[PDB]
Design a protein around this motif. Structure first.
Motif, PDB file in Angstrom:
ATOM      1  N   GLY A   1       0.806  -1.207   0.000  1.00 28.15           N
ATOM      2  CA  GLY A   1       0.000   0.000   0.000  1.00 28.15           C
ATOM      3  C   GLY A   1       0.842   1.261   0.000  1.00 28.15           C
ATOM      4  O   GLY A   1       1.977   1.258   0.477  1.00 28.15           O
ATOM      5  N   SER A   2       0.286   2.341  -0.538  1.00 26.54           N
ATOM      6  CA  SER A   2       0.995   3.614  -0.603  1.00 26.54           C
ATOM      7  C   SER A   2       0.498   4.570   0.476  1.00 26.54           C
ATOM      8  O   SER A   2      -0.341   5.433   0.218  1.00 26.54           O
ATOM      9  N   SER A   3       1.020   4.410   1.688  1.00 20.20           N
ATOM     10  CA  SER A   3       0.627   5.255   2.808  1.00 20.20           C
ATOM     11  C   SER A   3       1.375   6.584   2.775  1.00 20.20           C
ATOM     12  O   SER A   3       2.605   6.616   2.755  1.00 20.20           O
ATOM     13  N   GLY A   4       0.623   7.680   2.769  1.00 16.77           N
ATOM     14  CA  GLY A   4       1.231   8.998   2.737  1.00 16.77           C
ATOM     15  C   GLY A   4       0.311  10.047   2.144  1.00 16.77           C
ATOM     16  O   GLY A   4      -0.540   9.737   1.312  1.00 16.77           O
ATOM     17  N   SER A   5       0.484  11.293   2.574  1.00 18.28           N
ATOM     18  CA  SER A   5      -0.342  12.391   2.084  1.00 18.28           C
ATOM     19  C   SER A   5      -1.821  12.023   2.133  1.00 18.28           C
ATOM     20  O   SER A   5      -2.572  12.302   1.199  1.00 18.28           O
ATOM     21  N   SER A   6      -2.232  11.394   3.230  1.00 22.17           N
ATOM     22  CA  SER A   6      -3.621  10.983   3.400  1.00 22.17           C
ATOM     23  C   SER A   6      -4.539  12.197   3.491  1.00 22.17           C
ATOM     24  O   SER A   6      -5.507  12.315   2.741  1.00 22.17           O
ATOM     25  N   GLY A   7      -4.228  13.099   4.418  1.00 17.97           N
ATOM     26  CA  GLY A   7      -5.034  14.293   4.590  1.00 17.97           C
ATOM     27  C   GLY A   7      -5.796  14.293   5.902  1.00 17.97           C
ATOM     28  O   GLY A   7      -6.928  13.811   5.971  1.00 17.97           O
ATOM     29  N   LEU A   8      -5.175  14.833   6.945  1.00 16.29           N
ATOM     30  CA  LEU A   8      -5.802  14.892   8.261  1.00 16.29           C
ATOM     31  C   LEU A   8      -6.315  16.298   8.557  1.00 16.29           C
ATOM     32  O   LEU A   8      -6.086  17.230   7.784  1.00 16.29           O
ATOM     33  N   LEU A   9      -7.008  16.444   9.681  1.00 20.75           N
ATOM     34  CA  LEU A   9      -7.553  17.737  10.081  1.00 20.75           C
ATOM     35  C   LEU A   9      -7.033  18.144  11.457  1.00 20.75           C
ATOM     36  O   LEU A   9      -7.038  17.346  12.393  1.00 20.75           O
ATOM     37  N   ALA A  10      -6.589  19.391  11.571  1.00 18.10           N
ATOM     38  CA  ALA A  10      -6.072  19.905  12.833  1.00 18.10           C
ATOM     39  C   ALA A  10      -6.753  21.216  13.213  1.00 18.10           C
ATOM     40  O   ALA A  10      -7.280  21.924  12.354  1.00 18.10           O
ATOM     41  N   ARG A  11      -6.738  21.532  14.503  1.00 17.98           N
ATOM     42  CA  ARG A  11      -7.357  22.757  14.996  1.00 17.98           C
ATOM     43  C   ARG A  11      -6.306  23.836  15.241  1.00 17.98           C
ATOM     44  O   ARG A  11      -5.112  23.549  15.310  1.00 17.98           O
TER      45      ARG A  11
END
Length: 71
Positions: A1-11
């Motif tokens: 699998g290509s894990s990376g640059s998934s895209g999370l959310l921060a405050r």
């Protein structure tokens, strides 16, 4: 699998006043979209996207919000 640059959310615990484009300009109570965390270009920074900014952010002022389910 290509894990990376998934895209999370921060405050944003505090507004940020960047002097250059590299950094992102956000204000308290703002949900930034953490495009990628692995940023070798900047030590201790997060690449988020806001109003077409595409700038980095200080992990010291960003609170990585993670979900409870399968956390």
């Amino acid at each position: 699998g290509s894990s990376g640059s998934s895209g999370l959310l921060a405050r944003a615990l505090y507004d940020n006043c960047p002097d250059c484009s590299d950094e992102l300009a956000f204000s308290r109570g703002d949900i930034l979209t953490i495009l990628e965390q692995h940023v070798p270009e900047s030590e201790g920074w997060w690449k988020c996207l806001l109003h077409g900014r595409q700038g980095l952010a200080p992990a010291n002022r960003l609170q990585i919000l993670s979900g409870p389910s399968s956390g």
